[PDB]
Amino acid sequence: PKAVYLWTVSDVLKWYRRHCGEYTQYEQLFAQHDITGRALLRITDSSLQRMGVTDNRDREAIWREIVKQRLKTDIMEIRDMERLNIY
Amino acid sequence: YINIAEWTPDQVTDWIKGLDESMKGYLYEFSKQEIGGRALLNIRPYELENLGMLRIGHQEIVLEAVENLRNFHYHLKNDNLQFMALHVATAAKNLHRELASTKIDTRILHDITRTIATLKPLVGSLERTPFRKQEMYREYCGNVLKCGLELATIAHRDRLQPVPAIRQSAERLENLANFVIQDISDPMVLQPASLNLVTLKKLGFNIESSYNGIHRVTDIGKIEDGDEIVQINYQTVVGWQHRTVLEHLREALPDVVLTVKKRP
Numbered sequence: 001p002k003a004v005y006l007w008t009v010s011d012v013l014k015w016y017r018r019h020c021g022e023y024t025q026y027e028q029l030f031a032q033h034d035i036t037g038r039a040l041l042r043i044t045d046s047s048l049q050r051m052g053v054t055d056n057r058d059r060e061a062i063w064r065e066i067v068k069q070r071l072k073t074d075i076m077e078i079r080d081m082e083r084l085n086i087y
Numbered sequence: 088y089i090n091i092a093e094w095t096p097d098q099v100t101d102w103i104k105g106l107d108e109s110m111k112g113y114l115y116e117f118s119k120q121e122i123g124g125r126a127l128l129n130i131r132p133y134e135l136e137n138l139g140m141l142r143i144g145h146q147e148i149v150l151e152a153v154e155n156l157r158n159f160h161y162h163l164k165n166d167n168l169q170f171m172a173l174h175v176a177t178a179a180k181n182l183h184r185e186l187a188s189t190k191i192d193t194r195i196l197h198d199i200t201r202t203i204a205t206l207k208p209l210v211g212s213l214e215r216t217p218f219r220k221q222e223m224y225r226e227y228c229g230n231v232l233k234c235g236l237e238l239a240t241i242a243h244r245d246r247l248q249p250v251p252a253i254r255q256s257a258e259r260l261e262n263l264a265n266f267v268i269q270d271i272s273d274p275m276v277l278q279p280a281s282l283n284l285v286t287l288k289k290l291g292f293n294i295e296s297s298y299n300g301i302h303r304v305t306d307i308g309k310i311e312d313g314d315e316i317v318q319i320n321y322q323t324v325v326g327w328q329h330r331t332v333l334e335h336l337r338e339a340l341p342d343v344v345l346t347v348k349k350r351p
Contacts, residue, residue: 003298005298033143034109034143035143035144036144038147038298039148042151043143050143067193067200068243070200071200072243074203074239075245078203078206081207082229082236084214085214085228
């Protein structure tokens with residue numbers, strides 16, 4: 001249950017294979033650009049273009065997975081803040 | 088004086104060094120191109136690339152840290168609950184305008200994460216002095232978190248008609264933000280943040296560092312729990328890693344002067 005902001009580049013690559021398995025050709029981009037978990041939380045559609053994910057369909061699919069992972073992290077952080085407001 | 092815009096290139100590289108070990112390869116180019124405080128505060132991705140920082144992961148280390156540095160330098164007067172609520176209201180209204188069938192657009196999902204992000208400084212402030220131990224602010228915090236969880240779980244599909252449900256949550260979040268802006272008369276929500284120099288000659292506090300490099304006193308004379316440390320011996324540490332802040336504090340000898348942001 002390691003928080004995303006602690007993810008190493010290796011953790012991000014393992015995440016990419018799990019959720020972007022139909023887009024394996026862009027996996028090396030995340031390694032070459034040192035996309036840690038901290039970087040994964042700040043990537044936008046624009047920075048994916050700049051990285052070289054030129055195909056609009058490929059980029060939209062990858063961008064959606066990144067946003068969905070942020071929502072998962074958001075839910076985890078909201079529950080942590082909810083427990084901090086009760087305790 | 089903490090005029091970051093008047094930083095020399097040496098002060099810029101001094102600050103850049105503390106962000107991450109990955110920054111060490113770029114200090115030479117920052118100095119060579121004479122990146123001062125003004126250029127740092129407005130630095131853009133292509134300018135980082137002109138400095139040879141081509142790895143986007145490295146760019147985002149700088150850009151995230153500079154965004155915190157910009158907030159400390161330009162908006163200290165509005166570092167209060169009211170303007171945190173204004174940011175929440177702004178993001179919620181933006182999400183509402185964007186919403187004006189089973190699948191939620193990625194853009195809408197993105198707006199939800201950006202909206203939820205504005206909740207974090209507001210909630211974080213609500214859970215510190217002087218709002219932490221007031222029953223009304225604790226209930227208010229619970230309502231904000233309940234609405235935020237509603238937004239996130241619907242977006243994650245965790246919870247038929249997603250767009251109308253998201254629209255209702257965005258309106259509720261806007262109403263909750265306006266509770267501070269319109270309904271609360273507590274002067275504390277409008278108090279500007281202030282800086283104080285604390286000189287120590289010894290020192291039993293601990294430092295809790297957020298993920299983004301905000302360092303606050305915890306587990307503790309002129310220093311209270313939750314106060315943010317922005318400088319150690321006049322070296323700005325906003326955005327620095329937790330490890331390098333401790334290394335700088337430990338090396339600071341028994342005589343340490345802390346620049347502390349103080350709670351209302």
